[PDB]
Nucleic acid binder design. Structure first.
Lengths: 64, 94, 71, 84, 50
RNA sequence: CUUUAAUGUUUGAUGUUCUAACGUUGACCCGUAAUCCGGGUUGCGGACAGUGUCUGGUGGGUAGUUUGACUGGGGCGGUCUCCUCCUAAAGAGUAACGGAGGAGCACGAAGGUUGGCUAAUCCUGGUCGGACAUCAGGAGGUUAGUGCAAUGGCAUAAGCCAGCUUGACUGCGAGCGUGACGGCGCGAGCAGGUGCGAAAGCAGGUCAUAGUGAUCCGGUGGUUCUGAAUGGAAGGGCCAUC
RNA sequence: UGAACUCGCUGUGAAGAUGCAGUGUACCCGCGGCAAGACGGAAAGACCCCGUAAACCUUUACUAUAGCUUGACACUGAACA
RNA sequence: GUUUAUUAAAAACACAGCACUGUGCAAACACGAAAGUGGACGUAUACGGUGUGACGCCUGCCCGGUGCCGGGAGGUUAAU
RNA sequence: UUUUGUAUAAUGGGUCAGCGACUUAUAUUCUGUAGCAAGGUUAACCGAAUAGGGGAGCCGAAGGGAAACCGAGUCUUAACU
RNA sequence: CCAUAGGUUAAUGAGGCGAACCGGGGGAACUGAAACAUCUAAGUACCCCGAGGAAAAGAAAUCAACCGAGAUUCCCCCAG
C-alpha cells in the first residue's frame, strides 16, 4: 500500500521552487474592524513556512 | 450571553430557563462530605408570579438575562395599553 | 496544459508542429488540449509552429533560426 | 490523621514580560530602521537621526553608531547617531 | 457591548465600504465623513448604513 | 376596524341513514370421527376500527457514551486569558495555592492640525456665604492634571480651551525587536489622494502598555477569476466583511 | 528457595542491618522445644490516587430508540343536512 | 414460615387484613417482529398493579413543586 | 529492573537444557554505492520466458499566481524607486 | 342443481452431505478519531437461502468530445 496524503494539509500549502512551502495567514475571518489597517495589510499576502515547523509539513505530505 | 453556575448567583441575579425568567431571593450552601455540593435556591417567579423552588447541584449554569429594573413615571392611558416615561434618558415605553 | 522547451523541438517530425506529432513524440501526453513554446535555449532547425502559444522569447529565437509562427 | 480546612488566595496574576530596555548599546554600528530602545515612557529621548515611534520606541533613522547624551537643561538622556 | 458597529457605504458608484463602530444611543444621527476611495480614486463623502 | 346579508366561496367541523369494502375471539351447515383453519347463508358492527408510510408529543422501559486540569493526597474552596508593580539577585528572561491592584472599554471629539494658556492646597480682602461656589492679590511650586488600574513619562508639554477639519485614507515598505511556532510590535521613506499652517512641517488613530481568541462551516456586497459539451447561471476563488 | 563459610552491640546508609565501620563474645555438629527477627510464607493492595480504563445502577446529564399517543394520505364507499 | 448453597437467619422479606387505583371481557396487563397463549375455560364479592402489614384506639393541616385526572376557550405548533 | 538515589529489608529469578522478543510486504524520504547522464527507467503482458520485445506511464530539465493568464521572469498594485 | 374446495391412486422430479471460491437476504461491536455521539471499523465477522465448475455480469436509453471510440470480466496505469 502507498502513503495517503493528509487532505487537510494539501489544501493549505503549495510546493515552491526550492522545496519550501507557502501558506496563508490566519487572522482574517471575522471581527477585523477592531484591528488596524497595518495588521490587515501584512497578513494579506502569502508567507513562507518557518523552519521550526517545516518537518511536520514534509512528513504529512510526501508526494506534493 | 452570560453564564452563572450555582456558586455564582446568590441574591438578586435573574436566571432564564425555558422561560419564564426567575429571580433568586435567598439561598443557602451545603458542601457535604461524600457527594456533590448543592444549594437550596429559593427562587421567585416574575411573570405570574408566585414562587418556584429548585435545589441546584454544582451543575449546571443558567442564562442570566435580563436584570434591568429602574424608576419610571406613569403619564398616559388610552383604551387598553399604557405608557411610562424616564428621567435619565427620556425614552418612551409601552 | 503543458509546457514545451526549445530542446525537444527539432525532433517532432520534419518541420511541422501541432498538437499531434508531439503526442506521438511522447513529450506532452494524450489529454493535452493546449500547448506552448517557452524560451529555454539552443534551437537550431527551421521549426514551423502552427496553433501553439509562443510566449515572447522563443518567437525571437525560432525566427532567429529561420522559423515562422502562425496561429 | 486529621486534616483541617485550607483557605484561598486572591493573588497569583502576572503578565507576559514585554522585553523592554536598551537593544543596541553605545558605540554599536546599526542599520537604518533598527530599534535602539524599547521603553514605556521616554526614559531616553530621541536625538539626532533617531526617531520616536508611537510606542515611545526609539528607532534609528540613519546608519551609524549609537551615542548616548546627557544633554538638555532637564538633564535627560538623548540618543543620537553619528552618520557613518 | 454598548458600542455596536456600522457600515460606511460609499455614495459613489463603487461597492467599496469602510466599517467602524458608533454608539447609537448617544448620537443617533448618521456619519458623513469624507475619506479616500481606492476604486474611483476620489475623496467621496461616505454615508452610514448597517 | 366592526355589526349585517346577497353571492362563485375555499372547504373543514359532525350526524343521522344506507351497505357492498373491512372486523366478526355470535350462532348454524360442510370439508371433518376436528372448541385450529377454510368455505357458506345469516346476525351484529360499519366506512368507525385496525394495519402500513410520513410527522409532532411522551419516553431511563432500553441502548451508546461523557462527567476537565493544576493541587504541598481527592475531595471541598480558589485559579485558568490579558495588563501594572515587587519577588527578579544594577541587560533580558525567570517559579510557587508568594505580596498587591485592574481589564472583556470609551471617543467622530476625548482624533488630525494651527494658534494661545499653566496648575494643587493653604493665607488675606470681599453682598447673601459657611470647612469648602465665583472675584482680587501673594506665598508656593508641579505635592495638580492625564476618559479608567499601576509603574514609567511629559512645561517644546502628552495638561486645558478655541478656530478649521476627517491622515481613524488606499497600495507598499528597506529594516530590526519579540516569540518553539501560529503570531505580535515599531517602521523611515516611495506612489496616489486629502487635511491644517502664510511658510518650514505634521497626520495611515487616541501619552504608552490591558479593552481580546485560531480554524472549519454559514450569511451579505463587489470583482467573467473559474464555471464538468458549448453559450449562461448555480456552486467555488479573490477582496471587503458578519 | 539469587548465592551464603547465616553473632550481639552502637553508628552510618534508599532514612529500623546475619553481610558496611568500630568493638565485644563465641570449639565443630544434631535432636526436643518456644515464635522476637529474617520488614517470614500465602495473594502484581481490597483502602487512597493516577488512566482522557471497563462494568453495571440512578436521574429534570446529552443524542437516540422499543412501546404508548395525535393528525394527513392509503386500503375507503353512497345518500342528504 | 422464607433468604444471602460456600463467614451475616435478623429488627430483613413474606403474611392474613386494610386502602388507593386500573380493568365491562376480543378486558387491563404480560410474553411474542406476528399469529397465538397466559390472565381464564374466570368476569367487578372477579383480576392486575402499588403502598402499608394481625388486632385495639386512630390516621390532622397544606394543591405551591412534580406526577396523575378532567375541561376545552384563547395563545404558540409538525407532516400536509 | 525502575529510579534524584540501592548491600538495601524495592521488584524478579530453586537450578540446568531446549524454545522465547525490532520483522515482512508495499510506498516515500535521506546518506553510502553502481549504471546511464539533460535525460533516466519500464509496469502488466507476448515470450523455445530471471533473454529479448512492450515508452502505457512515472520523475527531472521553469517558475510565478487563488485562477484565467504571463513566462526567465512573475505576482500584489492605478503603477511600483 | 352446475361447479369447485376437499379425498384416493399413478407418473416423473426434489429432500441430505461437502475444504474454499461466487450472487442475493440480514447484519454488529471492540478498535481509529489519542475522550466521543456523525464517521471510521465495514458491508468486514457471522447468520440464511440458492446455483455452478467456475459463478456473477454482458451486446448501450454507455461514455466521450463537438473529433471520435463500439458488450462484460480481469491485470498495469491514470492517482493518494
Amino acid at each position: 500500500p502507498k502513503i495517503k496524503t493528509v487532505r487537510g494539509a494539501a489544501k493549505r500549502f503549495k510546493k515552491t521552487g526550492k522545496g519550501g512551502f507557502k501558506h496563508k495567514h490566519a487572522n482574517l475571518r471575522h471581527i477585523l474592524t477592531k484591528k488596524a489597517t497595518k495588521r490587515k495589510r501584512h497578513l494579506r499576502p502569502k508567507a513562507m513556512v518557518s523552519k521550526g515547523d517545516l518537518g511536520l509539513v514534509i512528513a504529512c505530505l510526501p508526494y506534493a | 450571553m452570560a453564564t452563572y453556575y450555582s456558586n455564582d448567583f446568590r441574591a438578586g441575579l435573574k436566571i432564564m430557563l425555558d422561560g419564564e425568567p426567575y429571580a433568586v431571593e435567598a439561598s443557602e450552601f451545603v458542601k457535604p462530605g461524600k457527594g456533590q455540593a448543592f444549594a437550596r435556591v429559593k427562587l421567585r417567579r416574575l411573570l405570574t408570579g408566585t414562587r418556584v423552588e429548585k435545589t441546584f447541584k454544582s451543575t449546571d449554569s443558567a442564562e442570566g438575562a435580563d436584570v434591568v429594573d429602574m424608576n419610571l413615571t406613569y403619564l398616559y392611558n388610552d383604551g387598553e395599553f399604557w405608557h411610562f416615561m424616564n428621567n435619565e434618558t427620556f425614552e418612551q415605553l409601552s | 496544459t503543458a509546457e514545451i522547451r526549445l530542446s525537444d523541438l527539432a525532433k517532432v517530425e520534419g518541420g511541422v508542429v501541432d498538437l499531434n506529432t508531439l503526442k506521438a513524440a511522447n513529450i506532452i501526453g494524450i489529454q493535452i488540449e493546449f500547448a506552448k513554446v517557452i524560451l529555454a535555449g539552443e534551437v537550431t532547425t527551421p521549426v514551423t509552429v502552427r496553433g501553439l502559444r509562443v510566449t515572447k522569447g522563443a518567437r525571437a529565437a525560432i525566427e532567429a533560426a529561420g522559423g515562422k509562427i502562425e496561429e | 490523621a486529621h486534616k483541617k480546612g485550607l483557605g484561598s488566595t486572591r493573588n497569583g496574576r502576572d503578565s507576559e514580560a514585554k522585553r523592554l530596555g536598551v537593544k543596541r548599546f553605545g558605540g554599536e554600528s546599526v542599520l537604518a530602521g533598527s530599534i535602539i530602545v524599547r521603553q514605556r515612557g521616554t526614559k531616553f529621548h530621541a536625538g539626532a537621526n533617531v526617531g520616536c515611534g508611537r510606542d515611545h520606541t526609539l528607532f534609528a533613522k540613519a546608519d551609524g553608531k549609537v551615542k548616548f547624551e546627557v544633554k538638555g537643561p532637564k538633564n535627560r538622556k538623548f540618543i543620537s547617531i553619528e552618520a557613518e | 457591548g454598548i458600542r455596536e458597529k456600522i457600515k460606511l457605504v460609499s455614495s459613489a458608484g463603487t461597492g467599496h465600504f469602510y466599517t467602524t463602530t458608533k454608539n447609537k444611543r448617544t448620537k443617533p444621527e448618521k456619519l458623513e465623513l469624507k475619506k479616500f476611495d481606492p476604486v474611483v480614486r476620489q475623496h467621496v463623502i461616505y454615508k452610514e448604513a448597517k
